[PDB]
C-alpha cells in the first residue's frame, strides 16, 4: 500500500574540519616535509568528505548513503588518533533537530557541541534516516526492491538502536529530543517492524504456505503494536507516525487471521474459518473508519467479505459447523525474520582510513 514511515535527515552547519586538524599535525610533526604534508592532505580530504556527506540534502541512492557511511567510518577511526578527548582541538558541530521545527518566537531547535561523539551520533542518525528513505522508496512488487528494503530497514533499526545505547555517554550535555534514547529507541522498533513487514510481503509474493504467512504477519503486528504504544503519550515524531503504526498493527493482525483462515479451510475447519474471517473483517472495518486518510484497505476488505460471505453461505446450508468464539481459538504463532543490524566499523564498503599510517 506504499504507506511506510521514513525519517528526515538532520541539518548541520558547514564546518572547516581541516584547519583545527593540520594545526595539530604541524604541531606534533615539525617535519617540513611529506608526512606532515600527507596528513594535511588527508585532513583536507576529510573536510571535503564532511561537506559531501552532510552538506548537500540530495540523492536517495546508494552513493549518497555510502558517502554518509564512509564519513561515519572515518570519524570513528579518528577519535583515538587525535587528542579530541581534551578540548585542545577546537571543533564545534552544530546540528538541528530532525523533528522539532521550533516555534516562530525562538528560532529553530539547534544544538552546538565541541564533541566528536556528538558528530558521530548525528551522522549515524542520518545514515539510518537516509537508509529508511531508500527502503521506503523501493518497488515492493520486485524481489530486488524487497531485498533492498529488508536490508535497509534492518540497518536503520540497528543504527537507531546503536544511538540509543551510546548517545548519553558520548555527549557532555543532554541531546536534542530527536537523538535522545527514547526517540531513537522508538525509531529502531518502527524500522524493525517495517523490515518484518517486508518479509511478509516477500512471503506473500513467493506464494509461501499460508501457515507461515500468518506467523510472519502476526509477528509484524507485535512490532507495530509495541511501536505505537511507545508513541501513545508522546508527540515528538511527526503527526502521521502514530495513526500509521496503529493502522499497520490492525492490518497485520487481519492479515494473520486471513491467512490462518485459509489454513483452517484447507483443513475443513469451516467454523474456525468463519470466526477468523469475521475477526479480520472487524479489524479492517475499524481501520477503514479510523485511519481512512492514512491507508487504503478497500481491496483487502472486499477479499475478506467475499470469502466470509461464501463461507457462511456454505456453512449454513451444508456443513453446519459451529462458529467458535475468538477466545476459544488457538493463538496464531509468531515468526521473526529480522534483527537490528549491529554497527561494526567499517559499515561502508571498501573503506580506507585516511589516517591509517598514524
Partner 1 sequence: EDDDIKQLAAWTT
Q: Point out which span in 46-54, 199-207, 267-275, 280-288 binds partner 1 (CB under 8 A).
A: 199-207
Q: Per the structure block, which three cell numbers stand in for 89?
A: 582541538
Find residue 110's DSSP bridge partners. 96
The number of beta carbons lying within 10 Å of the beta carbon of residue 103 is: 9
Least separation, in Å, of the C-beta of 284 and partner 1?
26
DSSP type of residue 15: -
Which span (198-206, 289-297, 306-314, 322-330) binds partner 1, by CB under 8 A? 198-206
Q: How far is it, in rounded angstroms, from Cα 27 to Cα 160? A: 38
When asked if residue 283 is in the footprint of partner 1 (CB under 8 A), the reply is: no
Fill in the DSSP letter of residue 172.
S
* Segment near partner 1 (CB under 8 A); pick from 68-76, 96-104, 108-116, 208-216: 208-216
Which of 162, 164, 202, 249 is the binder for partner 1 (CB under 8 A)? 202
Closest approach, Cβ 265 to partner 1, in A, equals 18
Assess 208 for contact with partner 1 (CB under 8 A): yes
* Residue 114 in the binding site for partner 1 (CB under 8 A): no
Nearer to partner 1, 74 or 154 (CB): 154
Residue whose CB is less far from partner 1, 208 or 345: 208
Q: Name which position in 64, 150, 192, 252 contacts partner 1 (CB under 8 A).
A: 150
- Please, what is the minimum distance in Å from the beta carbon of residue 250 to partner 1? 24
From residue 316 to residue 345, the character string flagging contacts with partner 1 as x (rule: CB under 8 A) and all else as - is -------------------x-x--------
Whose cell is 580506507? That residue is 352
CA dihedral defined by 299, 304, 305, 307, rounded to 10 degrees?
Answer: 120
Cell 535497509 belongs to 152
Q: Which stretch binds partner 1 (CB under 8 A): 60-68, 147-155, 258-266, 316-324?
A: 147-155
Closer by beta carbon to partner 1, 52 or else 211: 211
CB of 87 to partner 1, least distance (A): 43
Binding mask 8-47 for partner 1 (x = CB under 8 A): ----------------------------------------
29 CB burial (10 A radius; 0-12, 13-18, 19+): middle
CA angle, residues 251, 125, 236, in degrees to nearest 5:
55
Residue 199 near residue 337, CB atoms below 8 Å: yes
The whole-angstrom separation of Cα 356 and Cα 358 is 5
203 lines the binding site for partner 1 (CB under 8 A): yes
The region of 39-47, 84-92, 150-158, 274-282 touching partner 1 under the rule CB under 8 A is 150-158
Query: In whole angstroms, what is the distance from residue 219 CA to residue 333 CA?
Result: 8
Distance CA 1, CA 167 (A): 35
Identify the H or E element spanning 110: strand 110-113
Q: Could you report how far apart the first and last alpha carbons of the chain are, in Å?
A: 51
Q: Which is nearer to partner 1, 149 or 287 (CB)?
A: 149
Residue 268 makes contact with partner 1 by CB under 8 A: no
Segment interacting with partner 1 (CB under 8 A) among 34-42, 195-203, 231-239, 322-330 = 195-203
Residues 114 and 190 sit within 8 Å (Cβ to Cβ): no
Least spacing, CB of residue 20 vs partner 1, in Å:
41
Residue 193 dihedral angles phi and psi, to the nearest 5°: -60, -40
Comparison of 203 and 332: residue with beta carbon closer to partner 1: 203
Phi/psi of residue 111, nearest 5 degrees: -145, 130
Residues in contact with partner 1 by the rule CB under 8 A: 147, 150-151, 154, 199, 202-203, 208-209, 211-212, 335, 337
Amino acid at each position: 500500500m506504499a504507506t511506510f514511515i521514513s525519517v528526515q535527515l538532520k541539518k548541520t552547519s558547514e564546518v572547516d574540519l581541516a584547519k583545527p586538524l593540520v594545526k595539530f599535525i604541524q604541531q606534533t610533526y615539525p617535519s617540513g616535509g611529506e608526512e606532515q604534508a600527507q596528513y594535511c592532505r588527508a585532513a583536507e580530504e576529510l573536510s571535503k568528505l564532511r561537506r559531501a556527506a552532510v552538506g548537500r540534502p540530495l540523492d536517495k541512492h546508494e552513493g549518497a548513503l555510502e558517502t554518509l557511511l564512509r564519513y561515519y567510518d572515518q570519524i570513528c577511526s579518528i577519535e583515538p588518533k587525535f587528542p579530541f578527548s581534551e578540548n585542545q582541538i577546537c571543533l564545534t558541530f552544530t546540528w538541528k533537530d530532525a523533528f522539532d521545527k521550533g516555534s516562530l518566537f525562538g528560532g529553530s531547535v539547534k544544538l552546538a557541541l565541541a564533541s566528536l561523539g556528538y558528530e558521530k551520533s548525528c551522522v549515524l542518525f542520518n545514515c539510518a534516516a537516509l537508509a529508511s528513505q531508500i527502503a521506503a522508496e523501493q518497488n515492493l512488487d520486485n524481489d530486488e526492491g524487497l531485498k533492498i528494503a529488508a536490508k535497509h530497514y534492518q540497518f536503520a533499526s540497528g543504527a537507531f538502536l546503536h544511538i540509543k545505547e551510546t548517545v548519553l555517554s558520548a555527549l557532555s550535555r543532554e541531546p536534542t529530543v530527536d537523538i535522545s534514547p527514547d526517540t531513537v529507541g522508538t525509531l529502531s522498533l518502527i524500522m524493525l517492524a517495517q523490515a518484518q513487514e517486508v518479509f511478509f510481503l516477500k512471503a506473500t509474493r513467493d506464494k509461501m504456505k499460508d501457515a507461515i504467512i500468518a506467523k510472519l504477519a502476526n509477528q509484524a503486528a507485535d512490532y507495530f503494536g509495541d511501536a505505537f504504544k511507545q508513541c501513545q503519550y508522546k508527540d515528538t515524531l511527526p503527526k502521521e507516525v502514530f495513526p500509521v503504526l496503529a493502522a499497520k498493527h490492525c492490518i497485520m493482525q487481519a492479515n494473520a487471521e486471513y491467512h490462518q483462515s485459509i489454513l483452517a479451510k484447507q483443513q475443513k475447519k469451516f467454523g474456525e474459518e468463519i470466526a477468523r474471517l469475521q475477526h479480520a473483517a472487524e479489524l479492517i472495518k475499524t481501520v477503514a473508519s479510523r485511519y481512512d486518510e492514512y491507508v487504503n484497505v478497500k481491496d483487502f476488505s472486499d477479499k475478506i467479505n467475499r470469502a466470509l460471505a461464501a463461507a457462511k453461505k456454505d456453512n449454513d446450508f451444508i456443513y453446519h459447523d459451529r462458529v467458535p468464539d475468538l477466545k476459544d481459538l488457538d493463538p496464531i504463532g509468531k515468526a521473526t525474520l529480522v534483527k537490528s543490524t549491529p554497527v561494526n566499523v567499517p559499515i561502508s564498503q571498501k573503506f580506507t582510513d585516511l589516517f591509517e599510517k598514524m
